[PDB]
Design a protein around this ligand. Structure first.
Ligand SMILES: O=C(O)c1cn(CC2(n3ccc4cccnc43)CCCC2)cc(O)c1=O
Ligand SMILES: [Mg+2]
Ligand SMILES: [Mg+2]
Ligand SMILES: [Mg+2]
Ligand SMILES: [Mg+2]
Ligand SMILES: [Mg+2]
Ligand SMILES: [Mg+2]
Lengths: 705, 249, 745
RNA sequence: AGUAGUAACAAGAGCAAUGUGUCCGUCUCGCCUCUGCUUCUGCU
RNA sequence: GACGGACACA
C-alpha cells in the first residue's frame, strides 16, 4: 500500500523513493506496491553501502558510526545527476560506460554494481537481469524475500555480516507482508501511457467552439472522424449564387485611363534643406584656426560675404509671427559674432521659444488625477488635405540630375586589384564615379548626411540647449582643391526624444538668390527675409542680386535622422541598376560592354519628354537620373510613396505583360485604380510620380499607334 | 581545487531569497530564469552606436582596467572614468584606451588567434596561392542547389561531430549517449591529444572544433564547380554575365 | 526636357528594372501613438465579414461570440467568413488521398516531438502578453511569472520540465476560483528637477498581491494583446498585430509544429521553405506546368493575393482540420492539438493603450487606457472613434473586445497554408476530370495559380471553380490585387519571375551600413553583407567595390578611426596618429587602428585580423591579440583542468558598448533586483557545470541538489587521482553537509 | 507655429516592436535616476 | 545554444 511503506521505512528512504516515483511520473497511490518495491530497493542499496569505508592506506574498514565510503550510490539520484556521476567515474579510470544506469560503484574493486530484488526465483531473476545486462563489466547482486542471494559467479565482494543483515531485513519484511494480507499480489507484480483530458471549464469551452449544428465536442469529433465526402463541394457550388465569380477583364493599355491627380492648392516644398535654390558661402583650401570644427568653418565662410544690410521681411509665413523670425536672425547673427568655445548655444528668448515650440504641448497628467476635468476630448485624426501638382518639383528633379563642377563624393581607398574581374570592376567603377560624383544629387546626399549627423549628435549630447548647427558640405573642385561650403544654419530646439517618432523642432535659416515672390506657393511654410546684396559676374553684365534668407520651423525625428545619415546607399540603388544593364548586354555580346556604353555617345535610353517628344540620353545620364530618383525617394519619403509604389507596380507589370504578348487580364481594374489614387494626397514627389506614370502610359500608347 | 565554489555556495545559501530560488528552481527551469529580464530593452543598435561614439566614454569594461590602463593619456585624454553607481566594479572607457593598449600596452609573446581561427587562415592560404584565368563573358545559367559551405570532417555527419565535440571538451557532461562509431572514437582521441593543457576557454575550443569538424550546407545559385573550396569564392568566380577562371591553392 | 525615369521602361522590361519601383532608401512608415483604433478596425471588419452568422453568449467568459461557420453562402464578391465544414473536410480528405501516409508521418513526428519538448521552448518568443502584469513582457519573463503563479496556487506538474505537463497545468488552472498573482503598482511622488527647476511626478515601481476572480483570470488567459506594426513597407495605412499570452503559446506551438511537418512534405506549399529553395520550388512548378501541355493547350498564371486573410480564417475550421488530420491517432494527442483552435474560438483582443485626451481650457493631455474607455461619455470621442466605439460596445469585456471569428495576424500561418494547398490540390486533372486543371504554390495568403486548358473559356471556368471553392472555405481572392496572364512571368512575395527569377537588389538596401555592435563585429558584418549580395542578389562587381568604399567611409566615421595620415581631427586622432608613427608596417594595422582598407572583391570572405596578420608588426600583434585583453570577458578556470582566468582570443576591438535600461522619472530597483539575483544563481551554477552555456543542461533536480552532487563527486574523483588531500576532501564534504543542514532549516 | 497624418510629438512612465519563415553576424561581464558619472558633436 | 540584424507575408 502506502501507509504500510510509510510506517515500515525510514524518512530518508521514503523521501528518495517518492522522489524517484515523481521523476518517473507516478504517485505512491496509483502504484503503491511499486512504491513499496522502490523503497525496498532503496533500503537494500543503502544497506549495501552503510558503514563501509576505505582507509588512508587502501583497505576497507567495515565500521559502525575522516574516512571515505567504499560505494558511490547511483540509485536514488536524479537521472542526469546519476549520468554525471557515471561519466566522471568512467573518465577517472579508462573503463567503458555502462549502457544502463547501475546502482552502486565500488571504489575498492573499481566495479559498477547492480542490485536486484525479486519475488520469483533468485536464479531466474539473475538470468533475466544478466540477459538485460549482457555485454557489460557490471557486477549483479540479487536478493529475494526468501532470504537468498546470488551474485555474479558467486564471487562476492560484500562481507557476510552485512549480507546477513540485508537477508534478515528482507526475511522480516516478507514476514511483515503476510501479517496484514498484502503479499500474494507482490509476488505477481514483475517488470505507462500519455493522458491529456479536459477539465470541466475547458470542456465547456470546447463545446462552444463548434459548427453550430453540434452541441458537444465529442459528437463533433465523432462526426469528423467518420466523415466520408460525397460531392459536398459540387453541391455547394451548384447552390452558390452565380454572382460569385472571378470574371476576367481583358487588359489593353490603349483603353485604360490615366491616374486622377487631386485638386486643391498647389503642393509646397517640404525638404529639410533648400535644394535647387540653395546658395553657398565657400572657403577655398581652408586653413583657419580650428579648421574642421563646424562653427569655425561657418565663421570663415561668413567672413567671405561683405554685403550684409538690415534684414527686412519680404515674404511672410502666413501662419506665423514673422517678426519673431526676423528677431531670430538678428539674435543668431549677434551670437555668431561673439561666440566663445566650440559650440554656440542660444539664450532661450521669447521669439526663439516661439519658433521652437516651447510649451506648446499640453502637460501630460495621469487619468487618476484628471477625471473631474469637464472638457477632456479625444485627439483628432484628420486625413491630409489634398494638393495640386505644381511644376517646381519637376524643375527640382531636372536640376538634381545635372552635373556640377565639384566632386561631392570622396570614396575611400580600396585594396589592390589582383584578379582580372577586379580590374574590370575598377574600369567600370571609374566611369561610375565620373558620372555620379559630380551630380547635384550627390551634393544633396552629402548635405543630408552632414545635417542629419550634426542634428543627431546635437539631439543626443545637448538635449536642453538651443544649439546652432551650420549647414556644411565639403567638396573638391575641378583642380582638386578643397572647398568648404556653408548654406546657412539650423537652430535645434529641445530634444528629449523617447519614442522613435519623437520630433525635435528646429529652425532652418538658409541663404538663397531665388526671389520667393516669383513662385509663392512653393514657399508656404517659409518667412523669407532679404539680408544682403552680392555681385554676380556673368558674361552678359555683372549685377547686384539680393541675398535672401529662407527661415522656417521644421521638425525631424530619430528615424528620419537615421535614414538621412544613410543616404549614400542611394548611390548603390542607382549604380547596381545601371551595371545590371551593362551586364545584360555584356551577356549578349560575349564581351565587356562598359567601354562601348560609356564611350560610344549615342543617346540610347528614353529619360525625358521635350515638346519634340521622347528624349534619349547616354548611360551616364541614366546613372544621374536613377541617382536623383533614389535621392528624392529618400528626401521625400512618406507612406503615400510606399502605397503608390506598391500599387502602381502592379499596373506597370500588367503593361509589361501586354507588351510581352502574354494576354494580361484583371479581375477589378477600377479597384486597383482606387488603390493607386488613394495614395496620391499632397506629397509633391508622389504627385510627380503619378504624373510620370501618366506620361509613361501615354508614351506606351503612342508606341502602339 | 573545489573549496572556493562550495564556500561561495554556502555564502549564497545563507541568503534566504537565494536559497528559495536554488531549492525551488530545477535545472530545466534555470534555462527559463536565466533569460529573465525586467527593464526596458534598447532597440536600434546602429543608431545608438552613431550617437554613442560622439560621447566620451561609450565603452563599459571591468574594473581591472583601472590597474591596467592609466587614467590619462600623454595628450591629455582621459582613458576611463568610474561609473554612475555607488559601488560597482565597472568603468566607462574612452576608445582612446583601446588605442592606448594597441600602441603601448604589454606585448604578449603568445597569441591564440592563428590556432583558433585556423579555418580562415586556410581560406587565405587557398586564396593567396590561387591561380586566376581569363574572364569570359556569356550568359551564366545558375541552378539553385544545396552545396557545402563548410565541408566538415569526411567521416562524421554534423550530429556525430557535435557528439565528438561534447566528448572532447565536456566529457563529464555528455549524459547517457556514447560515441557509436570508430571514426568518432579516433577523432575524439586525436583532439583530446591536441588540446592538452589548453589555456583557451572551453566554449572557444568548442566553437573552434565546430569550425573544423561540422558540415554546414546552404542553398545557393551555382553555375560551375560545387566543391567546398569553390563555394567559398563563389562571389569571386561567378556573376550574372561573367565567369572568373580560378583554381584554389 | 523634363526628366522622367519611368521612360526607361520603354526600353528595359519592368522586371529587369524592378529595383527602380522600390523606394527603400527612405525611412519606412511608422505609427504614432496608439494602436487601439487599428484593433477596433480589425474587430469591426472581422465581425462584419461574418455578420450573418449565429450569436451566442459564452457561458464561461460572458462574451458575445459570432459563429459564421455553415452560414449562408455568399451572394456577392465581398469578403466572407462563411466557411462550410463539409467542404473543408472534403478538401482535407482529398489532400490525404493525394498524399498517402503524409498525415500519419507528420502526426507521428509531432508525437515524437511532444514527448521530448521542454518548457523553456516557450522562451523562443519575443514580447509576450504577460497576464500577471496585464502588460507586455519578454517571453522568458512571462513564462517565469506564469510558472511562479502556477506553483503558488498548487499547479506543480510543470516541475517535470516537459511542455505537455505545463500545458496540463494551464488547463487545470481554469478550475481555480481565486488566482492570487503578483502585480506591479506605482507609488507617485512630486519632486523638483534639480536641473530644469520643475515639479515632476516621480514614480517607484513596487510589487503588490491581487486576486483574480475565475472569470477575470479566464479572460486574461484568453487575451491577445495588440499593437501597431511599425516599419512596414508598401502600405498607406497601418494595421494591428497581436501577441498571445503564455497560456496560448504552448498549444499554438504544437499545432504549428504538426502543420509544419505537413507543409514540409507538400510540393505545393511555399512554407516552411524560403529564399533560394523557395525560388527553386517555384521554378520547378513552372517548368512542370509548362511541360504538361499539348500544342493546343493554354497556360495562365494568376499572381494572386487574398483579402483579409487572418480575419476570414476561422478557429472552428482549424478545429475541423486538426481533427481530420489526426484521425486515427491517440485521443490524448487529438485533444492536445485541439486546444489552440478552441482557445482562439474564445479569444478576446485587448484593445491596447487607449487614447490620448486633451483639455484645452486646462491645457492638459492624459492617456485613457482601454479599461477606462467604456466609462467615457461618447461625446468626447472624435467622429470616427465614436463610430467604432458604438459598434463594439456589445463586444467589450474588461478592456478587451470579444473576437470569436478570425485568427488574427499570423497566428496559424502553416495551417491556413495547408487549407490553401488543399484548394490547390483539388485541381489535379485525374481528380477534377474536366477541360481545365490547375496547380501552383501557396505560402500564407500569397499564391501562384497555374491554370491549364484547351481554350480561354476553359481558363475562365477553371478560375471560377478555384475562386468559388476558396469562397466555400472562407478564402477570398483579392480581385483588385490579383491579375492573370500567360505563364512565363509572375510575381510571388516580391520575387519577380520573367522566364527566370530576376534580382531585386533594392530590398537588400537597408542591410548595408554599420551595424553598431563593436568595431570588429561590424567590420565582419559589412564585408559579409557585400559578399552575400554578390552571391544572391546579383550585386555587380563595380557596385560591390563601391559598397566596400562606402562601408569603410561610414565605419571610419562611426568609430572615429580615420587613417593615421589624415588631416582630420576627432576625439581619437592623436592616439591613432601616435600608433601610426611608430608602426613600421602600417599595412598590418586594422582599420579601427587607423590602418588601410585591405578589402577588394577577392578577399571579402576572409576576416580582417587574418587578412592583415602577416603584415602586422610583432609588438602590435602581441598587444592587439593579447590574452590579458581587459576589454573582453574572461571566464574563470574551472575545477577540472587574483584567480585563474582563461586566455582571451578576441582582439581589443571586441569591446562592449555601455547600456542604458533607464526609464524617465522611474525607480525600478524593486523589480530589477530579481533579475540580478537570478543572474547570480545562474553564475554560481556554471562553476559546477561548465557546459551550461554551450548546451542547455537538463534535469528535474533542483539547482542546489545538482551542485551538491557535482561537488561531492568532483571531490571524490580529485581525491582518487591525487589532486587534493584527504583534508580538502573532508572539508568539501562537510561544507556540503552544512549546506544541506541550512537547506533543511 | 511646426513636424506630421486616422494619432501623435510639440519633454516629464519609453507602461506600444507579434507570429511564421529565409539569410547573416556574434559569443557567458556590464544595465540601477533626487543626486552619485560624464559636456562629448571635426565624414578632405 | 543564446543574443542581434536584414527581408518577406500574415
Ligand atoms: O531504475 C533502476 O535503477 C532500477 C529499477 N528497478 C525496477 C524498480 N524501479 C525502480 C524505479 C523504477 C522506475 C521505473 C521502472 N521501474 C523502477 C525497482 C522496484 C520497482 C521497479 C530495479 C533495479 O534493480 C534497478 O536498478
Ligand atoms: Mg539502478
Ligand atoms: Mg537495482
Ligand atoms: Mg492579403
Ligand atoms: Mg499576401
Ligand atoms: Mg497642426
Ligand atoms: Mg531580424
Amino acid at each position: 500500500m502506502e501507509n504500510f511503506v510509510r510506517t515500515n521505512f525510514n524518512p530518508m528512504i521514503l523521501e528518495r523513493a517518492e522522489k524517484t516515483m515523481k521523476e518517473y511520473g507516478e504517485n505512491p497511490q496509483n502504484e503503491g506496491n511499486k512504491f513499496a518495491a522502490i523503497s525496498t530497493h532503496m533500503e537494500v542499496c543503502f544497506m549495501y553501502s552503510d558503514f563501509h569505508f576505505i582507509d588512508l592506506e587502501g583497505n576497507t574498514i567495515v565500521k559502525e558510526n575522516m574516512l571515505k565510503h567504499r560505494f558511490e550510490i547511483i540509485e536514488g539520484q536524479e537521472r542526469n545527476i546519476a549520468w554525471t556521476i557515471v561519466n566522471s567515474i568512467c573518465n577517472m579510470t579508462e573503463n567503458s560506460k555502462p549502457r544502463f544506469l547501475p546502482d552502486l560503484y565500488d571504489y575498492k574493486t573499481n566495479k559498477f554494481i547492480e542490485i536486484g530484488v525479486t519475488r520469483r526465483k533468485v536464479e531466474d531473476y539473475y538470468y533475466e537481469k544478466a540477459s538485460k545486462l549482457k555485454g557489460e563489466n557490471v557486477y549483479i547482486h540479487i536478493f529475494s524475500f526468501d532470504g537468498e542471494e546470488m551474485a555474479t559467479d558467486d564471487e562476492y565482494i560484500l562481507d557476510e555480516e552485512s549480507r546477513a543483515r540485508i537477508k534478515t531485513r528482507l526475511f522480516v519484511l516478507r514476514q511483515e507482508l503476510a501479517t496484514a494480507g498484502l503479499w500474494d499480489s507482490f509476488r505477481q507484480s514483475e517488470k505507462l501511457e500519455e493522458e491529456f483530458s479536459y477539465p470541466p471549464t475547458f470542456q465547456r469551452l470546447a463545446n462552444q467552439s463548434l459548427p453550430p449544428s453540434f452541441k458537444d465536442y465529442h459528437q463533433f469529433k465523432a462526426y469528423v472522424s467518420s466523415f466520408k465526402a460525397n460531392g459536398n463541394i459540387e453541391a455547394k457550388l451548384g447552390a452558390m449564387s452565380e454572382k460569385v465569380n472571378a470574371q476576367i477583364e481583358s487588359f489593353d493599355p490603349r483603353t485604360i485611363r490615366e491616374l486622377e491627380l487631386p485638386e486643391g492648392k498647389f503642393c509646397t516644398q517640404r525638404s529639410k534643406f533648400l535644394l535647387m535654390d540653395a546658395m553657398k558661402l565657400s572657403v577655398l583650401n581652408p586653413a583657419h584656426e580650428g579648421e574642421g570644427i563646424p562653427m569655425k568653418d561657418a565663421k570663415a565662410c561668413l567672413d567671405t560675404f561683405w554685403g550684409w544690410k538690415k534684414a527686412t521681411i519680404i515674404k511672410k509665413h502666413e501662419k506665423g509671427v514673422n517678426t519673431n523670425y526676423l528677431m531670430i536672425w538678428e539674435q543668431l547673427l549677434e551670437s555668431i559674432k561673439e561666440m566663445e568655445g566650440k559650440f554656440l548655444n542660444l539664450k532661450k528668448t521669447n521669439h526663439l521659444k516661439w519658433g521652437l515650440g516651447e510649451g506648446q504641448a499640453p502637460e501630460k497628467m495621469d487619468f487618476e488625477d484628471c477625471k473631474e476635468v469637464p472638457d477632456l476630448f479625444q485627439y483628432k485624426s484628420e486625413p491630409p488635405e489634398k494638393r495640386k501638382l505644381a511644376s517646381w518639383i519637376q524643375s527640382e528633379f531636372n536640376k538634381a540630375s545635372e552635373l556640377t563642377n565639384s566632386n561631392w563624393i570622396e570614396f575611400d581607398e580600396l585594396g589592390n586589384d589582383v584578379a582580372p574581374i577586379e580590374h574590370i570592376a575598377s574600369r567600370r567603377r571609374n566611369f561610375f564615379t565620373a558620372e555620379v560624383s559630380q551630380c547635384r544629387a550627390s551634393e544633396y546626399i552629402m548635405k543630408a548626411v552632414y545635417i542629419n549627423t550634426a542634428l543627431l549628435n546635437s539631439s543626443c549630447t545637448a538635449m536642453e540647449e538651443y544649439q546652432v548647427i551650420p549647414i556644411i558640405t565639403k567638396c573638391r573642385d575641378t583642380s582638386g582643391q578643397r572647398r568648404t561650403n556653408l548654406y546657412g544654419f539650423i537652430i535645434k530646439g529641445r530634444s528629449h526624444l523617447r519614442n522613435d517618432t519623437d520630433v525635435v523642432n528646429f529652425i532652418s535659416l538658409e541663404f538663397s538668390l531665388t526671389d520667393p515672390r516669383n513662385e509663392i506657393h512653393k514657399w508656404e511654410k517659409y518667412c523669407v527675409l532679404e539680408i544682403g546684396d552680392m555681385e554676380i559676374r556673368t558674361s552678359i553684365s555683372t549685377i547686384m542680386k539680393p541675398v535672401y534668407l529662407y527661415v522656417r520651423t521644421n521638425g525631424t525625428s530619430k528615424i528620419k535622422m537615421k535614414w538621412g545619415m544613410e543616404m549614400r546607399r542611394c548611390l548603390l540603388q542607382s549604380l547596381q541598376q545601371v551595371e545590371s544593364m551593362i551586364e545584360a548586354e555584356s551577356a549578349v555580346k560575349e564581351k565587356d560592354m562598359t567601354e562601348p556604353f560609356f564611350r560610344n555617345r549615342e543617346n540610347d535610353w528614353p529619360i525625358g519628354e521635350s515638346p519634340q517628344g521622347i528624349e534619349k540620353g547616354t548611360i551616364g545620364k541614366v546613372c544621374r537620373v536613377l541617382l536623383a530618383k533614389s535621392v528624392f525617394n529618400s528626401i521625400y519619403a512618406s507612406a503615400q510613396l510606399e502605397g503608390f509604389s506598391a500599387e502602381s507596380r502592379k499596373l506597370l507589370l500588367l503593361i509589361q505583360a501586354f507588351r510581352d504578348n502574354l494576354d494580361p487580364g484583371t479581375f477589378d481594374l477600377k479597384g486597383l485604380y482606387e488603390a493607386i489614387e488613394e495614395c496620391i494626397i499632397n506629397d509633391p514627389w508622389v504627385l510627380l510620380n503619378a504624373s510620370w506614370f501618366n506620361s509613361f502610359l501615354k508614351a506606351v500608347q503612342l508606341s502602339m499607334g | 581545487s573545489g573549496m572556493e565554489r562550495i564556500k561561495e555556495l554556502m555564502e549564497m545559501v545563507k541568503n534566504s531569497r537565494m536559497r528559495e530560488i536554488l531549492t525551488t528552481t530545477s535545472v530545466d527551469h534555470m534555462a527559463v530564469i536565466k533569460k529573465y529580464t525586467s527593464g526596458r530593452q534598447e532597440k536600434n543598435p546602429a543608431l545608438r552606436m552613431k550617437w554613442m561614439m560622439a560621447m566620451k566614454y561609450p565603452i563599459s569594461a571591468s574594473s581591472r582596467i583601472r590597474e591596467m590602463i592609466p587614467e590619462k593619456d600623454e595628450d591629455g585624454n582621459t582613458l576611463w572614468t568610474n561609473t554612475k553607481d555607488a559601488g560597482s566594479n565597472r568603468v566607462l572607457v574612452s576608445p582612446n584606451a583601446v588605442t592606448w593598449w594597441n600602441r603601448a600596452g604589454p606585448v604578449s609573446d603568445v597569441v591564440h588567434y592563428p590556432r583558433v581561427y585556423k579555418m580562415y587562415f586556410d581560406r587565405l592560404e587557398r586564396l593567396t596561392h590561387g591561380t586566376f584565368g581569363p574572364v569570359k563573358f556569356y550568359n551564366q545559367v545558375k541552378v539553385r542547389k544545396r552545396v557545402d559551405i563548410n565541408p566538415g570532417h569526411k567521416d562524421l555527419t554534423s550530429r556525430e561531430a557535435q557528439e565528438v565535440i561534447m566528448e572532447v571538451v565536456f566529457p563529464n557532461e555528455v549524459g547517457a549517449r556514447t560515441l557509436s562509431s570508430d571514426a568518432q572514437l579516433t577523432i575524439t582521441k586525436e583532439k583530446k591529444e591536441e588540446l592538452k593543457n589548453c589555456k583557451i576557454s572551453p566554449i572557444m575550443v568548442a566553437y573552434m572544433l565546430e569550425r573544423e569538424l561540422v558540415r554546414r550546407t546552404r542553398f545557393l545559385p551555382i553555375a560551375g564547380a560545387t566543391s567546398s573550396t569553390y563555394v567559398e569564392v563563389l562571389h569571386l568566380t561567378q556573376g550574372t554575365c561573367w565567369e572568373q577562371q580560378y583554381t584554389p591553392g | 526636357m523634363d526628366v522622367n525615369p519611368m521612360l526607361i521602361f520603354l526600353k528595359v522590361p519592368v522586371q529587369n528594372a524592378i529595383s527602380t519601383t522600390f523606394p527603400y532608401t527612405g525611412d519606412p512608415p511608422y505609427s504614432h501613438g496608439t494602436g487601439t483604433g487599428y484593433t477596433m478596425d480589425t474587430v469591426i471588419r472581422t465581425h462584419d465579414y461574418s455578420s450573418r452568422g449565429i450569436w451566442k453568449t459564452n457561458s464561461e467568459t460572458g462574451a458575445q461570440q459570432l459563429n459564421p461557420i455553415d452560414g449562408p453562402l455568399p451572394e456577392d464578391n465581398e469578403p466572407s467568413g462563411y466557411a462550410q465544414t463539409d467542404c473543408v473536410l472534403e478538401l482535407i480528405e482529398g489532400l490525404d488521398r493525394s498524399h498517402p501516409g503524409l498525415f500519419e508521418t507528420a502526426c507521428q513526428e509531432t508525437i515524437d516531438a511532444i514527448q521530448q519538448t521542454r518548457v523553456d521552448k516557450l522562451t523562443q518568443g519575443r514580447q509576450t502578453y504577460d497576464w500577471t502584469l496585464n502588460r507586455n513582457q519578454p517571453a522568458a519573463t512571462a513564462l517565469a511569472n506564469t510558472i511562479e503563479v502556477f506553483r503558488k496556487n498548487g499547479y506543480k506538474l510543470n516541475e517535470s520540465g516537459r511542455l505537455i505537463d505545463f500545458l496540463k497545468d494551464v488547463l487545470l488552472s481554469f478550475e481555480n476560483d481565486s488566482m492570487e498573482v503578483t502585480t506591479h503598482f506605482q507609488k507617485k511622488k512630486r519632486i523638483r528637477d534639480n536641473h530644469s527647476k520643475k515639479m515632476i511626478t516621480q514614480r517607484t515601481i513596487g510589487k503588490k498581491r491581487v486576486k483574480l476572480t475565475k472569470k477575470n483570470y479566464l479572460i486574461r488567459a484568453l487575451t491577445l494583446n495588440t499593437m501597431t506594426k511599425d516599419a512596414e513597407r508598401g502600405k498607406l495605412k497601418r494595421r494591428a498585430i497581436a501577441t498571445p499570452g503564455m497560456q496560448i503559446r504552448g498549444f499554438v506551438y504544437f499545432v504549428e509544429l504538426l502543420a509544419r511537418n505537413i507543409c514540409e512534405r507538400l510540393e505545393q506549399s511555399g512554407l516552411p521553405v524560403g529564399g533560394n529553395e523557395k525560388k527553386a520550388k517555384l521554378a520547378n512548378v513552372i517548368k512542370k506546368m509548362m511541360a504538361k501541355s499539348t500544342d493546343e493547350e493554354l497556360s495562365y498564371t494568376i499572381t494572386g493575393d487574398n483579402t483579409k486573410w487572418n480575419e476570414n480564417q476561422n478557429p472552428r475550421i482549424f478545429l475541423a482540420m486538426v481533427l481530420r488530420i489526426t484521425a486515427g491517432q491517440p485521443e490524448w494527442f487529438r485533444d492536445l492539438l485541439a486546444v489552440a483552435p478552441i482557445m482562439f474560438s474564445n479569444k478576446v483582443a485587448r484593445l491596447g493603450r487607449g487614447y490620448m485626451f486633451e483639455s484645452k481650457s486646462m491645457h492638459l493631455r492624459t492617456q485613457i487606457s482601454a479599461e477606462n474607455l467604456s466609462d467615457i461619455n461618447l461625446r468626447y470621442f472624435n467622429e470616427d472613434t465614436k463610430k467604432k466605439i458604438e459598434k463594439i460596445r456589445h463586444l467589450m469585456v474588461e478592456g478587451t473586445a470579444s473576437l470569436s471569428p478570425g485568427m488574427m495576424m499570423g497566428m496559424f500561418n502553416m495551417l491556413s497554408t495547408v487549407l490553401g494547398v488543399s484548394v490547390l490540390n483539388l485541381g489535379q486533372r485525374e481528380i477534377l476530370k474536366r477541360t481545365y486543371w490547375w496547380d501552383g504554390l501557396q505560402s500564407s495568403d500569397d499564391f501562384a495559380l497555374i491554370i491549364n486548358g484547351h481554350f480561354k473559356e476553359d481558363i475562365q471556368q477553371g478560375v471560377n471553380h478555384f475562386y468559388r471553392t476558396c469562397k466555400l472555405v472562407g478564402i477570398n481572392m483579392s480581385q483588385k490585387k490579383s491579375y492573370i496572364n500567360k505563364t512565363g512571368t509572375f510575381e510571388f512575395t516580391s520575387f519577380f519571375y520573367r522566364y527566370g527569377f530576376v534580382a531585386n537588389f533594392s530590398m537588400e538596401l537597408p542591410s548595408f551600413g554599420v551595424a553598431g555592435n563593436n568595431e570588429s563585429a561590424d567590420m565582419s558584418i559589412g564585408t559579409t553583407v557585400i559578399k552575400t549580395n554578390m552571391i544572391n542578389n546579383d550585386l555587380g562587381p563595380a557596385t560591390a567595390q563601391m559598397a566596400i568604399q562606402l562601408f569603410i567611409k561610414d565605419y571610419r566615421y562611426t568609430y572615429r578611426c580615420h587613417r593615421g595620415d589624415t588631416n582630420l581631427e576627432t576625439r581619437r586622432t592623436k592616439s591613432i596618429k601616435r600608433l601610426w608613427t611608430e608602426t613600421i608596417s602600417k599595412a598590418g594595422l586594422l582599420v579601427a587602428d587607423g590602418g588601410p582598407n585591405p578589402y577588394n572583391l577577392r578577399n571579402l570572405h576572409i576576416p580582417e585580423v587574418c587578412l592583415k596578420w602577416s603584415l602586422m608588426d610583432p609588438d602590435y600583434r602581441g598587444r592587439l591579440c593579447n590574452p590579458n585583453n581587459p576589454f573582453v570577458h574572461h571566464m574563470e578556470v574551472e575545477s577540472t583542468n587574483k584567480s585563474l582566468e582563461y586566455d582571451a582570443v578576441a582582439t581589443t576591438h571586441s569591446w562592449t558598448p555601455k547600456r542604458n535600461r533607464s526609464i524617465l522619472n522611474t525607480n525600478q530597483r524593486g523589480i530589477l533586483e530579481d533579475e540580478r539575483i537570478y543572474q547570480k544563481c545562474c553564475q554560481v551554477f556554471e562553476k559546477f557545470f561548465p557546459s551550461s552555456t554551450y548546451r542547455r543542461p537538463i534535469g528535474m533536480a533542483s539547482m542546489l541538489d545538482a551542485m551538491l552532487s557535482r561537488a561531492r563527486i568532483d571531490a571524490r574523483i580529485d581525491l582518487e587521482s591525487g589532486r587534493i588531500s584527504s583534508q580538502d576532501f573532508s572539508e568539501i564534504t562537510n561544507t556540503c553537509k552544512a549546506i544541506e543542514a541550512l537547506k533543511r532549516q
